[PDB]
Design a protein around this ligand. Structure first.
Ligand SMILES: [Cl-]
Ligand SMILES: [Cl-]
Ligand SMILES: [Zn+2]
Ligand SMILES: [Zn+2]
Lengths: 28, 21, 29, 21, 28, 21, 29, 21, 29, 21, 28, 21
């Protein structure tokens, strides 16, 4: 699970992958 | 914030778990 | 705008586009 | 909820604005 | 529906979201 | 063009509606 | 290239990749 | 049309070139 | 992390996020 | 395989690490 | 099939589109 | 590498076929 530069929709996609049905909050 | 940790800098999926509900 | 049929990451992408800078909370429940 | 609705049924971008901060 | 920097495939995705079955034209 | 209005500059989803068929 | 099974935004993404700079018209009809 | 075909059935990248400007 | 239900490009996106710089091999077989 | 499994069934991010170089 | 700047997940998506069930290798 | 040919520089889908298995 290497480190990466995640921005915008790519970051939200990553959060979705990691959090799933648990849900998550995206607050810049 | 998440943006400064993952977008400005880089981060691991484990750090992303910090933002799950 | 048209009505939507969104599942999974597609819904999250829609939330990102609609909320943008304001951010959002994804709560599937 | 609206989230479930978007997937099983349909939803509007307006309903999605409800989830914004 | 805040303002955003939308480029390339991200812009087409946004157009798809907004236009749907109505269709749209992407002409740079 | 759409690119100059939404990519170079920023734009709202309402402006995107200008490009629907 | 392989044949494709594309629906929704996935089809639009395919159109973007294939047409690129030339742009394209998405007409579901 | 080809668009509908890509989703209900299958289509080639060549058929998609038909939609390019 | 949660379990996943991933098909098509969504699986490839997941592989990219998990493998990142290390790269990966996508072998549907 | 795991790839097929992710789509027909379910899979973990850990199983996906198997495909990394 | 014009030439484009494809990076990160966008490049993997393009590889997926082009290669499909044949599979592919992403090695930076 | 693929990154230098398609990301640094630009490339065609035909060049992408070079990376299929
Ligand atoms: Cl990007
Ligand atoms: Cl899907
Ligand atoms: Zn991107
Ligand atoms: Zn999808």
């Amino acid at each position: 699970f290497v480190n990466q530069h995640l921005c915008g929709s790519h970051l939200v996609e990553a959060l979705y992958l990691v959090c799933g049905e648990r849900g998550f909050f995206y607050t810049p | 914030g998440i943006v400064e940790q993952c977008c400005t800098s880089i981060c691991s999926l484990y750090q992303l778990e910090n933002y799950c509900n």
